[PDB]
Amino acid sequence: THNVVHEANGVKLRETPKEFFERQPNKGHIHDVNQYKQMYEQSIKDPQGFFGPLAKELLSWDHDFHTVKSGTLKNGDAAWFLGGELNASYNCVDRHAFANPDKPALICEADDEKDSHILTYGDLLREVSKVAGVLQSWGIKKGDTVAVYLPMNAQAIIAMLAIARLGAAHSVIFAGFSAGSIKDRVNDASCKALITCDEGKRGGRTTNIKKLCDEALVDCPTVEKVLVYKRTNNPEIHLTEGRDYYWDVETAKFPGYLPPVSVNSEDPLFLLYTTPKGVVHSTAGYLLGAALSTKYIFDIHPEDILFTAGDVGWITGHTYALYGPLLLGVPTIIFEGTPAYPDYGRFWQIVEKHKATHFYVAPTALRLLRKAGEQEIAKYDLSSLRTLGSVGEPISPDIWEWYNEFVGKNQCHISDTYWQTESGSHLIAPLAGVVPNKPGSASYPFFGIDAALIDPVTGVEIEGNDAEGVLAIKDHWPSMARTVYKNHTKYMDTYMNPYPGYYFTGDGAARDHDGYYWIRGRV
Amino acid sequence: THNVVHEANGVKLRETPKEFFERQPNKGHIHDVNQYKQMYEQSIKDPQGFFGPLAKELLSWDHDFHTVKSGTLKNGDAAWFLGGELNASYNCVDRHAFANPDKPALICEADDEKDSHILTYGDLLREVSKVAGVLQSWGIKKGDTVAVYLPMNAQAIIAMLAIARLGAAHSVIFAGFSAGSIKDRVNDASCKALITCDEGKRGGRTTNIKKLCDEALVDCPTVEKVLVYKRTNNPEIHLTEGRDYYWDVETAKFPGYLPPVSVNSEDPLFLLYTTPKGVVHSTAGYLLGAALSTKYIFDIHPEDILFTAGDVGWITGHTYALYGPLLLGVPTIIFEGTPAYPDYGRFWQIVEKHKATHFYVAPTALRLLRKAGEQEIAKYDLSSLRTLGSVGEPISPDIWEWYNEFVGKNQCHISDTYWQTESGSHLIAPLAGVVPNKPGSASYPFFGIDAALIDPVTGVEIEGNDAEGVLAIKDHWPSMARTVYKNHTKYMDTYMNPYPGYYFTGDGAARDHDGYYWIRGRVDDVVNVSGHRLSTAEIEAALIEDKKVSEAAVVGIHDDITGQAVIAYVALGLRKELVLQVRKTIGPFAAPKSVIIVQDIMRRILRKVSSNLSNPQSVEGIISAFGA
Amino acid sequence: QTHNVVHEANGVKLRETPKEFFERQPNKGHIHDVNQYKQMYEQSIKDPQGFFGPLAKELLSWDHDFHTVKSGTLKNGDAAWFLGGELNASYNCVDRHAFANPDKPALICEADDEKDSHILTYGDLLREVSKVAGVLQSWGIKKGDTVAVYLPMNAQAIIAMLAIARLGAAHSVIFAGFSAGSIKDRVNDASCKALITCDEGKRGGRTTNIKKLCDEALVDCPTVEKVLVYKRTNNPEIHLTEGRDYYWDVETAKFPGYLPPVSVNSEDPLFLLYTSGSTGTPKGVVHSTAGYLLGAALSTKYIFDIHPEDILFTAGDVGWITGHTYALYGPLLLGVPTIIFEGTPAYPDYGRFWQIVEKHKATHFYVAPTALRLLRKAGEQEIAKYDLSSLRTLGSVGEPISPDIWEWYNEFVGKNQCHISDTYWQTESGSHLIAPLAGVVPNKPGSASYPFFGIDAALIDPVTGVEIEGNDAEGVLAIKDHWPSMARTVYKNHTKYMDTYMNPYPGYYFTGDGAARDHDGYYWIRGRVDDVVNVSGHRLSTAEIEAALIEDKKVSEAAVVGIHDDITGQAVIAYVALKEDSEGLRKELVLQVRKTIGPFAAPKSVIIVQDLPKTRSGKIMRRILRKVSSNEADQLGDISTLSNPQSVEGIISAFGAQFG
Ligand SMILES: Nc1ncnc2c1ncn2[C@@H]1O[C@H](COP(=O)(O)O)[C@@H](O)[C@H]1O
Numbered sequence A: 001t002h003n004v005v006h007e008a009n010g011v012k013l014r015e016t017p018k019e020f021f022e023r024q025p026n027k028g029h030i031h032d033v034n035q036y037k038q039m040y041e042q043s044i045k046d047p048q049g050f051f052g053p054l055a056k057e058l059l060s061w062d063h064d065f066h067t068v069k070s071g072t073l074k075n076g077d078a079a080w081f082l083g084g085e086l087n088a089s090y091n092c093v094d095r096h097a098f099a100n101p102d103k104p105a106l107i108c109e110a111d112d113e114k115d116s117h118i119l120t121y122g123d124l125l126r127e128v129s130k131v132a133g134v135l136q137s138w139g140i141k142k143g144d145t146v147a148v149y150l151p152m153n154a155q156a157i158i159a160m161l162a163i164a165r166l167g168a169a170h171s172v173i174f175a176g177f178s179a180g181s182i183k184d185r186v187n188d189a190s191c192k193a194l195i196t197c198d199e200g201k202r203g204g205r206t207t208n209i210k211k212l213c214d215e216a217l218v219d220c221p222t223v224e225k226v227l228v229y230k231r232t233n234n235p236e237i238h239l240t241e242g243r244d245y246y247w248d249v250e251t252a253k254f255p256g257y258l259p260p261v262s263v264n265s266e267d268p269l270f271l272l273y274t275t276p277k278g279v280v281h282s283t284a285g286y287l288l289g290a291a292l293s294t295k296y297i298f299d300i301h302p303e304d305i306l307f308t309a310g311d312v313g314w315i316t317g318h319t320y321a322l323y324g325p326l327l328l329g330v331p332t333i334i335f336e337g338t339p340a341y342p343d344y345g346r347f348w349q350i351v352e353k354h355k356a357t358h359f360y361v362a363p364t365a366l367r368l369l370r371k372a373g374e375q376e377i378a379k380y381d382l383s384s385l386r387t388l389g390s391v392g393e394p395i396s397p398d399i400w401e402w403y404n405e406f407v408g409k410n411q412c413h414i415s416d417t418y419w420q421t422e423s424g425s426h427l428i429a430p431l432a433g434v435v436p437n438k439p440g441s442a443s444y445p446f447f448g449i450d451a452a453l454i455d456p457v458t459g460v461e462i463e464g465n466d467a468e469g470v471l472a473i474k475d476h477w478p479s480m481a482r483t484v485y486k487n488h489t490k491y492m493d494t495y496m497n498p499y500p501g502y503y504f505t506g507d508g509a510a511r512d513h514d515g516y517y518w519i520r521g522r523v
Numbered sequence B: 001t002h003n004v005v006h007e008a009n010g011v012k013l014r015e016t017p018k019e020f021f022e023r024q025p026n027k028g029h030i031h032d033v034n035q036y037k038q039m040y041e042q043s044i045k046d047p048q049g050f051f052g053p054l055a056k057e058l059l060s061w062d063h064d065f066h067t068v069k070s071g072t073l074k075n076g077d078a079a080w081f082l083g084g085e086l087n088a089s090y091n092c093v094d095r096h097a098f099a100n101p102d103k104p105a106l107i108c109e110a111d112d113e114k115d116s117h118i119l120t121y122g123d124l125l126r127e128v129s130k131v132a133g134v135l136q137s138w139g140i141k142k143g144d145t146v147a148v149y150l151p152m153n154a155q156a157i158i159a160m161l162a163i164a165r166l167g168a169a170h171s172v173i174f175a176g177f178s179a180g181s182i183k184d185r186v187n188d189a190s191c192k193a194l195i196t197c198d199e200g201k202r203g204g205r206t207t208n209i210k211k212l213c214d215e216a217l218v219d220c221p222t223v224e225k226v227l228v229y230k231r232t233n234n235p236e237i238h239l240t241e242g243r244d245y246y247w248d249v250e251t252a253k254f255p256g257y258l259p260p261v262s263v264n265s266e267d268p269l270f271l272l273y274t275t276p277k278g279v280v281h282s283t284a285g286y287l288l289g290a291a292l293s294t295k296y297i298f299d300i301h302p303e304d305i306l307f308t309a310g311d312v313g314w315i316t317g318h319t320y321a322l323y324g325p326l327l328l329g330v331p332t333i334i335f336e337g338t339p340a341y342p343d344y345g346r347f348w349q350i351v352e353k354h355k356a357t358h359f360y361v362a363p364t365a366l367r368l369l370r371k372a373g374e375q376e377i378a379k380y381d382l383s384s385l386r387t388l389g390s391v392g393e394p395i396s397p398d399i400w401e402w403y404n405e406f407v408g409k410n411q412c413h414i415s416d417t418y419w420q421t422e423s424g425s426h427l428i429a430p431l432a433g434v435v436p437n438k439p440g441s442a443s444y445p446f447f448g449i450d451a452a453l454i455d456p457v458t459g460v461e462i463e464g465n466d467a468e469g470v471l472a473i474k475d476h477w478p479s480m481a482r483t484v485y486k487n488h489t490k491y492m493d494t495y496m497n498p499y500p501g502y503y504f505t506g507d508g509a510a511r512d513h514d515g516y517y518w519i520r521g522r523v524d525d526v527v528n529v530s531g532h533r534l535s536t537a538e539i540e541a542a543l544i545e546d547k548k549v550s551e552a553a554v555v556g557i558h559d560d561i562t563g564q565a566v567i568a569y570v571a572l573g574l575r576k577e578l579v580l581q582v583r584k585t586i587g588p589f590a591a592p593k594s595v596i597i598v599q600d601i602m603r604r605i606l607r608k609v610s611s612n613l614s615n616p617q618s619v620e621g622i623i624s625a626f627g628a
Numbered sequence C: 001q002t003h004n005v006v007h008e009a010n011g012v013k014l015r016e017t018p019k020e021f022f023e024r025q026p027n028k029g030h031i032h033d034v035n036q037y038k039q040m041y042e043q044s045i046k047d048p049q050g051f052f053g054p055l056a057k058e059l060l061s062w063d064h065d066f067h068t069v070k071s072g073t074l075k076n077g078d079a080a081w082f083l084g085g086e087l088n089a090s091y092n093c094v095d096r097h098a099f100a101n102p103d104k105p106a107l108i109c110e111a112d113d114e115k116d117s118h119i120l121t122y123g124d125l126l127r128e129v130s131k132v133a134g135v136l137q138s139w140g141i142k143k144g145d146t147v148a149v150y151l152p153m154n155a156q157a158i159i160a161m162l163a164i165a166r167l168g169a170a171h172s173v174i175f176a177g178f179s180a181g182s183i184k185d186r187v188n189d190a191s192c193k194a195l196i197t198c199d200e201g202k203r204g205g206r207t208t209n210i211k212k213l214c215d216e217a218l219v220d221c222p223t224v225e226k227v228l229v230y231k232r233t234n235n236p237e238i239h240l241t242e243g244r245d246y247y248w249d250v251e252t253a254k255f256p257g258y259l260p261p262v263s264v265n266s267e268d269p270l271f272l273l274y275t276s277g278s279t280g281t282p283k284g285v286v287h288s289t290a291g292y293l294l295g296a297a298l299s300t301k302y303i304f305d306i307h308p309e310d311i312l313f314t315a316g317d318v319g320w321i322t323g324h325t326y327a328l329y330g331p332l333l334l335g336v337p338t339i340i341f342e343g344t345p346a347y348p349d350y351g352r353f354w355q356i357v358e359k360h361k362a363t364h365f366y367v368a369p370t371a372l373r374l375l376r377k378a379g380e381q382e383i384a385k386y387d388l389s390s391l392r393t394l395g396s397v398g399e400p401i402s403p404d405i406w407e408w409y410n411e412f413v414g415k416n417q418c419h420i421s422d423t424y425w426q427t428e429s430g431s432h433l434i435a436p437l438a439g440v441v442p443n444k445p446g447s448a449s450y451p452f453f454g455i456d457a458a459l460i461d462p463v464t465g466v467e468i469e470g471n472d473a474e475g476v477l478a479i480k481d482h483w484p485s486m487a488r489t490v491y492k493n494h495t496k497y498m499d500t501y502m503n504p505y506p507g508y509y510f511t512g513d514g515a516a517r518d519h520d521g522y523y524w525i526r527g528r529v530d531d532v533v534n535v536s537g538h539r540l541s542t543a544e545i546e547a548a549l550i551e552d553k554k555v556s557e558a559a560v561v562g563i564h565d566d567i568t569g570q571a572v573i574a575y576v577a578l579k580e581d582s583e584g585l586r587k588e589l590v591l592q593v594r595k596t597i598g599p600f601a602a603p604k605s606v607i608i609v610q611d612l613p614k615t616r617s618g619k620i621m622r623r624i625l626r627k628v629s630s631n632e633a634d635q636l637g638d639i640s641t642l643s644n645p646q647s648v649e650g651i652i653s654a655f656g657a658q659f660g
């Protein structure tokens, strides 16, 4: 029994169902919860000997690295795989296109299913090369930043991979932002180019996209050129001559292959803004964390198919709609529309349509379907799923049991992934087919994450279980953000200085007698 | 006997003379024709196992490659030696300078022999490094393009190698071109710099070089600086302060070594313009093709000396005057003048002077020397020669016999080489000392070249020998051109789309019972509309048969649905009467998509108009008419 | 054996390295004995590929391997080493040591006032270099650019140099004693895109103006886009130009403490160091990356006998090549601590050098004979106050060391227990050329002894231009083949490079020095042959000083020459003719030279004459001014070949009257 953790008193360990293993294509990646702690204890006491080999296994290098880990949280100088060189789009596209060009890559589901398509890895290589050819033709090169203002569709996945192909950092801007929020993000990074579309389709209603760009671009002198996709092909849309150009028109000029550009492990892969602050992520570190978590926390295999019902304007689409799954050579499902269009059975038609084996979504949608589309679940077949995931905020133990039976049929594993934009990948989450669940908890911290609670009053680490306090990590990890663009002081003041030697997550949590962490919300 | 390939009837096979092997420095690279077929068959079925090792033998790499071959013709994404890095100037200069800096590299014969000279590989490394140093200090870098407007002399070779040393792509503009032809090519490539000379010398006559550049440059805003070599040192030649700088003045400021810049295998090495279309060639694949063909088709050894009587303004000078021979580390003769100056024995005086072992020339020049200078050949010792090459057009059996008797004394091997600017290197040619000749035939296709004859109407491959049709290639090869600069769609529409799954040479050919290919003339207008091959020339004739039409012009343009579409412009309801005329005389599917009637052939203008001898005022009415 | 030519060597007892040297040596020496050295030297000459290849792979960390050890020839000016190789200078001097031992001292910084002293570990140095490199990167600095440095000899100068080299750019360090005109010359010749400087300096307790001289020069340096200013004094009265000048502490705060180093080619330029020549224009000497670094590591390791446990105190300034190679690159490459002294040997008193050695138990001390002369004159009494027993190697740099100063150095600083390394070299050699290896080569006081690895030294007859075979000889000192750390060019002026070093004696490198070789093969430097004047270790251009004096509108013509000086080694004497209080104007002209070049270029004396001796062509005959400034007027010989032989009498009278 727990005197402190009131959430822990009387909670049955929900061992992973037996049908989860009937549906695995191959022997699971970690046998039992006992091997997970042998691999975890090594990843904390011996990061060099744990992440080194994994980096060599999961990523393809253009130059080997000479030092696995360097720096400290106190000094904000973390670095991983120093001296190595790779390319993000080579690991996400090329190396799978060479292996099996016809394997699906981007299973795109448009607003209207009448506008849906699928890109094989061989097609994704030809389209990324042509868009990278355009950007290279325009003078975009390693060290530049390129803004993206696109809905959740193929064009966004291609623009990011194309920008990363040249060694430039893509700064994705959620399609729903205003001209002001566009102006602020473009000017902070001094983007030299922007990729966008004429207008989108969000649940039947068409959205003004180019209009908001033009309104914002009038205060963005750094933007030399804009690439515009024809999502609707509406001719009343204005393109300023000499600045704006058409996706289809430019890409038609360049070949289906462009060489990737090697970047250093610690070269910025992208900027993502949360005044807004631009979180910066390294290349090697972020990519490894994205691939590891997707392989272990979701139990992804070459045959699997991931449907992250998120958006690339946020970190969830970055890591688990794009980089995570494509690094592993599995197809990912890119959903442009809403969970209510045409009706509340769209998520479920798609899972049935493509036999998706993993589903990843935030609770905020589970409360929308629990309070509207609870009947549409039985229409469609959801027998392909092994793993179901929660991302956004905490997951009610109510919605947990709802998410488990209605969508999972009491046959799936459920992983409640805790993590922020600054972490890059999952921090605390239960591994599919390994970690038994406690409804409402994130469970054990992931490889390389040395979680710890700190008494906010004294600022000392709270040893022993059955306790609460501020959540903090005692060392940095590969996918940790390395700075805030052009403002490292705010980066230190926010994460590294409140508790020297620790990384301040900004949340409060509790650890029960079993070690399971309970996320008690922001402080 | 042959019912189709009449050229081949009663043609005695011509074995390589005994003197060829007496003059050969070492054992030949291929023992006999049976070893050649074994090697060729592997180059087709297993290009990875064949070209992989050769790329590691013949080229020096800064970064290893992980995949030999990628892409398909149908997708226009061919690539070779992916992930690899190298430098063209290192493989053509540095590595040979280190091994033997005193070995001759450029044997330069000037317009007047008084000005001839010889650069060793050591000399070439210093002179290339110094020019590259100037370009580098000017801001030229990987990704840029630099134009070259120079005669066929040492400075042209140095300029090309210095540009490639920085990872930039050179674009060589033949020195005979006008100011307008210069204007078009510089602007299409947006060259940041130009390398040229004040004036040229050709046949004793002074040519204006800088004068035409100044004339062109007024409309080339991308050119930031020009390097000017004092070829004549004429003091009346004006240099624009702030833009033009002297070759000798700037090179004096920089050292004789500059580190080469590594580039990717598929980074552009150069643009070569032919509306002129800028043919783009890769780095690794092109260089491997240049070395392989020069080695095996001409039988080049380190002891040899190559004289390619061509100009770097064309692909022949690119591949077989520069990259080919310098990659293999042998000396190459760079001839600045003409075959008639000071007299009609100059070619042969040069061979004798430098004891050249290999001679490579176009049939056009052989015809001129046969007509006006046959008496001069016997005056010179040409016994150093072993291989006689022919380039640019099929060689008549008569010209073949003349070439064989009067130049080779019936003692040399003759290699009629078929290829084109877009192939980078030889496609069909008799390997020196290996393949016996049939006069007028190019014989067998080369390594990596899977040649086929396809029916021009159906696009289906013709099986069996004693056949004729369109010459097409079933898979890309290392030195195949990769795109047209900033215009990959024209590249696809010209080479890959007309006959999908094949490369379209634009030539017709025939294959005899021994598998020897006989290049025929060019094929005609092939416009492919939903699988129907249409003739724009054939449609114009039909429209003109209508007594209401004075003149008619038909062209082809890209179409997202049907592949291509034919648009007919007509100079004099009526549009319906003309479309039926074409259906009856040609065929039902030959009707133009559209028939536009205008008030007033330079079709280069109609293609750009419909896509969206001079009389420029009509252009406005045609643009208005197409909309109407 | 007696010498008919090398008189310096007659009756000179050979001086073995004392026994106590090896007692204080931490490990087995890097070279077994002098016979192993001869074998290794012979291979470095006959087989440089087999010798320098392995050493380059031991001492440097490479991002890409090299395929050819050595290329090019002196005659063609195309020397190159380790071709195809890639590396980074800041990685080899910082990163690789920080990963191994982040807490090991790297920069032992002794400020002008010891109250301000501090110590940076290799870990600290990595963060501060990364932050400065981060600022430069955000400003647009990239491989191929040049960045000027105008800083005193403190930690920030070292960080600026390493941060510039981290990006693949080349730093150009401008000695802090230079005026705005000398800053102007160097920044414009190199077209520096940025400048790193400080608000004010501290030297001898007195505040020096640094930023003020930059603003004065920068008004004519249109290539400089941004300036980084360190708050050395934090004086708030120092103006920063909005849009151009930015504070070191403010900008570095914006960037993280790690930045990836940029790989550069072995032959990409590492730095420019502007040097005075026979013209009035400084020539920017350019050094490669790989070859220069290998030379710094090789010489520092084998000539000084540096081990990981050791601590090096090079009493030099990064404004000159001595600080470049043996205060920064040499010791940091080997991963040992180096003492960076910002002050003077006289402040607070004439024992400061020894307080520093004792404080930090320095094992290696490297100093100029000019300072040894000063301490013998004014501070000998201070030595007995300090424990100097940590020292074992005592070096001398920049000028000839008198046999007397050698003995003083040996007895009073080394207690007759240390090895002395008289090191001969020059800015253009990058590293040592001729020097006694510590613990290996016995000394002849005043001789540089044997040439170092890769240095094939020769003496050339000045009359015939042919190499002199056999020993007991003298002539022009020349080197028969290039070496790894040899300078590669003069910036954007390779013709001056060829005309100065390679063309005078084709097939050879021309040091500009004369020398003699005794029967034991020891070399004895006889000084410059090319009328280059060395004042307190500072290479000066008499032509540049003449130009400064003429800028005064009262001067018609001026001639400057060099003469021996008991204090500074040599002194420049200026003869001035006016167009027309003398001692007054003499002060106004000396100040004129201070304004245009720097305070350390000021003439010792200014003699005012009516006419300068001239040829019939009209050129000034400085050969006569030199013999007069010395008491060798009786060696002038026939002067009827002058166009004004009567001026000679007035020159002898003027020098006698005004010198003093
Ligand atoms: N599984 C979870 N349980 C509770 N809170 C979560 C979970 N996942 C994410 N969060 C919250 O979401 C925040 C992430 O913010 P951001 O990713 O920056 O939009 C975290 O700081 C947590 O407060």
Ligand SMILES: Nc1ncnc2c1ncn2[C@@H]1O[C@H](COP(=O)(O)O)[C@@H](O)[C@H]1O
Pocket: B314, B315, B316, B390, B391, B392, B393, B394, B395, B416, B417, B418, B419, B420, B421, B442, B507, B519
């Ligand atoms: N041996 C040959 N026989 C027939 N045509 C040739 C031959 N060599 C080159 N060509 C033609 O020359 C053109 C290529 O130009 P070039 O490569 O400069 O000779 C193409 O139209 C080829 O068909």
Ligand SMILES: Nc1ncnc2c1ncn2[C@@H]1O[C@H](COP(=O)(O)O)[C@@H](O)[C@H]1O
Pocket: C275, C321, C396, C397, C398, C399, C400, C401, C422, C423, C424, C425, C426, C427, C428, C448, C511, C512, C513, C525, C527, C528, C534, C537, C538, C539
């Ligand atoms: N050990 C030494 N003995 C005599 N002269 C030296 C010695 N070291 C340096 N020098 C002189 O200092 C010059 C170096 O010039 P710099 O290093 O540019 O000031 C040499 O050319 C010599 O004239």
Ligand SMILES: [Cl-]
Pocket: B059, B060, B061
């Ligand atoms: Cl090799």
Ligand SMILES: [Cl-]
Pocket: none
């Ligand atoms: Cl080895």
Ligand SMILES: [Cl-]
Pocket: C276, C277, C278, C279, C283, C500
């Ligand atoms: Cl000089």
